[PDB]
Design a protein around this ligand. Structure first.
Ligand SMILES: [Cl-]
Ligand SMILES: [Cl-]
Length: 162
């Protein structure tokens, strides 16, 4: 198992513009296009991201390209973030993937706001951090996915995904 496989399971793959769980226009493997209510704005953002007239549809290849970009951006973002970097540095390989997952989903900023949880992960207090992570909007809105990420942090293994 690796980050790509992990995220492919949590996000799915769709080749046509769709609304995410929060109602935002998205495509491919969890690639947010926009938070605007306008399908056109979405369609516009899409073409700009692909560089062609897409008419709201893309190919698999294109979906995978956006995915590679997004994963790279997430890692780089973590590594640039004063709050995130130290946490990342302190973790083992598996749990690092869990932190990338959260960043991909919620943004650097979003994750950086899980102050208490971050401190606990940094102190290697697995069970405590898991419980704290659970007390969040995130957990309440997408519980199955949250639970998978949380178990990953708790155990340090890929069991939730197997
Ligand atoms: Cl809560
Ligand atoms: Cl879910």
């Amino acid at each position: 198992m690796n980050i790509f496989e992990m995220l492919r399971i949590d996000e799915g793959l769709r080749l046509k513009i769709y609304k995410d769980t929060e109602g935002y226009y998205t495509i491919g493997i969890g690639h947010l296009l926009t938070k605007s209510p306008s399908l056109n704005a979405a369609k516009s953002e899409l073409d700009k991201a692909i560089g062609r007239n897409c008419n709201g549809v893309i190919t698999k290849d294109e979906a995978e390209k956006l995915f590679n970009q997004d994963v790279d951006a997430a890692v780089r973002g973590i590594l640039r973030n004063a709050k995130l970097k130290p946490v990342y540095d302190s973790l083992d390989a598996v749990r690092r993937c869990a932190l990338i997952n959260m960043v991909f989903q919620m943004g650097e900023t979003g994750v950086a706001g899980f102050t208490n949880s971050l401190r606990m992960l940094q102190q290697k207090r697995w069970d405590e951090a898991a419980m704290n992570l659970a007390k969040s909007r995130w957990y309440n809105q997408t519980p199955n996915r949250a639970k998978r990420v949380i178990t990953t942090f708790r155990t340090g293994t890929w069991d939730a995904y197997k």
